[PDB]
């Protein structure tokens, strides 16, 4: 496993003990063999759970989610998938790790796909070893894998809007339910319907994840309404999962705009991870999984794989060489390796637009490749009339850094900057030059 030139996929079923049992054994062996090691966590929540499982082992936590005093003698580093990809992109020196361990290696965010591509390329070159830990590796076709205890699987119509009748089974339940919705806006509507019926609801999404997840431990709740982010190792002490089996898919149209297509079916990997939140306790057989549609390979042509190539084309590997995507997920995009490689100054703009600007990868690339500098926000206002961003069915307006009231009409339209109130508020602040 730990020998150079080897990539191992640790594919034990969900709840089999990959993080709490297998991971500390691997880390202990890596420290014994003097292997400079990196452990990659999908989120800050998982990074905190990993510290608990690794307590007593000398690990340098490169995240503010863990409060530890490092001795300076650790040869194992732990950081989030995004942090690893970010440090590779920035001028900062990243050690050439002998062993690369990725937990929740099924994560399909652009920085996670790019991290897999880089690490797998290093292993292919015979320079390093890697271990990818996931119950659902890329290409998996089984939405119903093994579990610690039997699960009641039921195909049923699941609401995606508020309802007045026809779904008594949803509210008649007396336990705790984790409900996967296709979007933040869809979750808001269902959460309001359940709150009106007397239920205590917590909502989770990528932007509110660390703060709102704490509420699942600190208070009594009846429902957790979440997007696909809870597929990445978040654990709940729940009795039931309700799964719409739907997700939004960012799609690049004619290479000039990004729309959020769907809702459409999730992959089998996503369905298995959603179901995998329950059936984890061998002492409580009969947790329920209610599912509202079929699976499909909706990752083919998904913007995230093209965005992963934009990231990889701008990471130094060796001379003019470029890291390829991890082989089982390479056909998800039709791209030319190196097509997105930027010159030094435009690359710095690209990185700053993502890191400080908080823009999606595709949108950051359009701005940087056009030769626009980070602080120049004229492009947020000079697009075509069809790129007008709407807020409450009326064009969104902002006061520019010059003091002029203008309609938000970006030269490149990426639907992710206005998919919910929180995203549109952050994009308005960016267009106004507030960051
Ligand atoms: N899962 C769930 N539930 C059911 C149960 O647990 N059951 C049992 C136990 C034990 C035994 F021995 C037998 C059975 C409820 C709620 S959640």
Which of 286, 288, 289, 290 for a ligand 1 pocket mutation test, highest count of atoms within 8 Å of Cβ? 286
Beta-bridge partner residues of 178: 224, 241
Q: How far is the CA of 233 from the centre of ligand 1 (A)?
A: 23
**Distance between CA atoms of 133 and 99, rounded to whole angstroms?**
13
- Vertex 105: Cα angle to 100 and 109 (nearest 5): 115
Cβ atoms 47, 66 nearer than 8 A: yes
**Distance between CA atoms of 271 and 246, rounded to whole angstroms?**
9
Two tokens, residue 59 = 């690990």
User: Which residue is associated with the tokens 């206005």?
Assistant: 418
Q: What is the DSSP letter of 323?
A: P
Task: Tell me which residue has its CA closest to atom 6 in ligand 1.
Answer: 284
Look at the alpha carbons of 366, 372, 373, 377 in this order and tell me if their dihedral is positive or negative: negative
Cβ atoms 239, 175 nearer than 8 A: yes
**Distance between CA atoms of 1 and 23, rounded to whole angstroms?**
13
Alpha helices in 251-379 (DSSP H): 268-275, 303-312, 344-355, 361-369
- Vertex 261: Cα angle to 41 and 231 (nearest 5): 25
Shortest-distance atom of ligand 1 to CA 149 = 1
- Write phi, then psi, for 177 (nearest 5 degrees): -115, 135
Shortest-distance atom of ligand 1 to CA 284 = 6
Report strand pairing: 59-61 vs 99-103.
Answer: unpaired
Q: Is the CB of 284 under 6 A from ligand 1?
A: yes
**Distance between CA atoms of 2 and 131, rounded to whole angstroms?**
8
E-strand stretches of 201-245: 201-204, 223-226, 240-243
Q: Is the CB of 237 under 6 A from ligand 1?
A: no
Resolution (A): 1.7
**Distance between CA atoms of 323 and 40, rounded to whole angstroms?**
18
Two tokens, residue 45 = 């929540």
- Write phi, then psi, for 143 (nearest 5 degrees): -80, -10
Distance from the Cα of residue 213 to its chain's centroid: 15
Q: Is the CB of 55 under 6 A from ligand 1?
A: no
Backbone torsion region of residue 25, taken as left when φ is above 0, otherwise alpha when ψ lies between -120 and 50, otherwise beta = alpha
Alpha helices in 3-131 (DSSP H): 23-32, 44-53, 81-89, 110-124
Q: How far is the CA of 287 from the centre of ligand 1 (A)?
A: 8
Sequence-separated (6 or more) residues with CB below 8 Å from residue 324: 117, 120, 121, 124, 312, 330, 337
Q: Which long-range contacts (CB under 8 A, 24 or more apart) does 336-344 make?
A: 337/309, 337/312, 337/313, 338/313, 339/309, 339/313, 340/309, 340/310, 340/313, 340/314, 340/365, 340/369, 341/313, 341/314, 342/313, 342/314, 342/368, 342/369
Closest CA to 188 of 199, 209, 204: 204
At residue 77, the 3 state secondary structure works out as strand
The experimental technique used to determine this model is: X-ray
Other C-beta atoms lying within 10 Å of the C-beta of residue 351: 21
E-strand stretches of 106-162: 129-133, 151-155
């Amino acid at each position: 496993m730990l020998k150079k030139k080897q990539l191992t996929v640790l594919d034990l079923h969900p709840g089999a003990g990959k993080t709490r049992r297998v991971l500390p054994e691997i880390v202990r062996e890596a420290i014994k063999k003097r292997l400079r090691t990196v452990i990659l966590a999908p989120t800050r929540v998982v990074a905190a759970e990993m510290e608990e499982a690794l307590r007593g082992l000398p690990v340098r936590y490169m995240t503010t989610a863990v409060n530890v005093t490092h001795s300076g003698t650790e040869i194992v580093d732990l950081m989030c998938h995004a942090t690893f990809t970010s440090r590779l992109l920035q001028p900062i020196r990243v050690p050439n790790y002998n062993l690369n361990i990725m937990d929740e290696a099924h994560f399909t965010d652009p920085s996670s796909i790019a991290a897999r591509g880089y690490i797998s390329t290093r292993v292919e070159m015979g320079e390093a070893a890697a271990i990818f830990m996931t119950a659902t590796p890329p290409g998996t076709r089984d939405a119903f894998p093994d579990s610690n205890s039997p699960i009641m699987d039921t195909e049923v119509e699941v609401p995606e809007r508020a309802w007045s009748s026809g779904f008594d089974w949803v509210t008649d339940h007396s336990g705790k339910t984790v409900w996967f919705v296709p979007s933040v806006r869809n979750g808001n509507e269902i959460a309001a319907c359940l709150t009106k019926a007397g239920k205590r609801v917590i909502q989770l999404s990528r932007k509110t994840f660390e703060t709102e997840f704490q509420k699942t431990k600190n208070q009594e709740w009846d429902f957790v309404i979440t997007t696909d982010i809870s597929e990445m190792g978040a654990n709940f002490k729940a009795d039931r999962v309700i799964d719409s089996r739907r997700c939004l898919k960012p799609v690049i149209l004619d290479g000039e705009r990004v729309i959020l297509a769907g809702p459409m079916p999730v992959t089998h990997a996503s369905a298995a991870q959603r179901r995998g939140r329950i059936g984890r306790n061998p002492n409580k057989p009969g947790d329920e999984y209610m599912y509202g549609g079929g699976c499909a390979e909706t990752d083919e042509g998904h913007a995230h794989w093209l965005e992963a190539r934009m990231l990889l084309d701008n990471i130094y590997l060796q001379d003019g060489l470029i890291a390829s995507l991890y082989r089982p997920e390479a056909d998800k995009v039709a791209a030319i390796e190196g097509e997105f490689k930027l010159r030094t100054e435009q690359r710095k703009t690209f990185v700053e637009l993502m890191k400080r600007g908080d823009l999606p990868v595709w949108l950051a690339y359009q701005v940087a490749s056009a030769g626009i500098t980070y602080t120049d926000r004229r492009w947020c206002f000079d697009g075509t009339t069809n790129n007008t961003i709407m807020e409450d069915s009326v064009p969104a307006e902002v006061w520019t850094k010059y003091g002029e009231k203008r309609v938000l009409k970006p030269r490149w339209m990426d639907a992710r900057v206005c998919s919910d109130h929180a995203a549109l508020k952050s994009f308005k602040e960016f267009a106004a030059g507030k960051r």
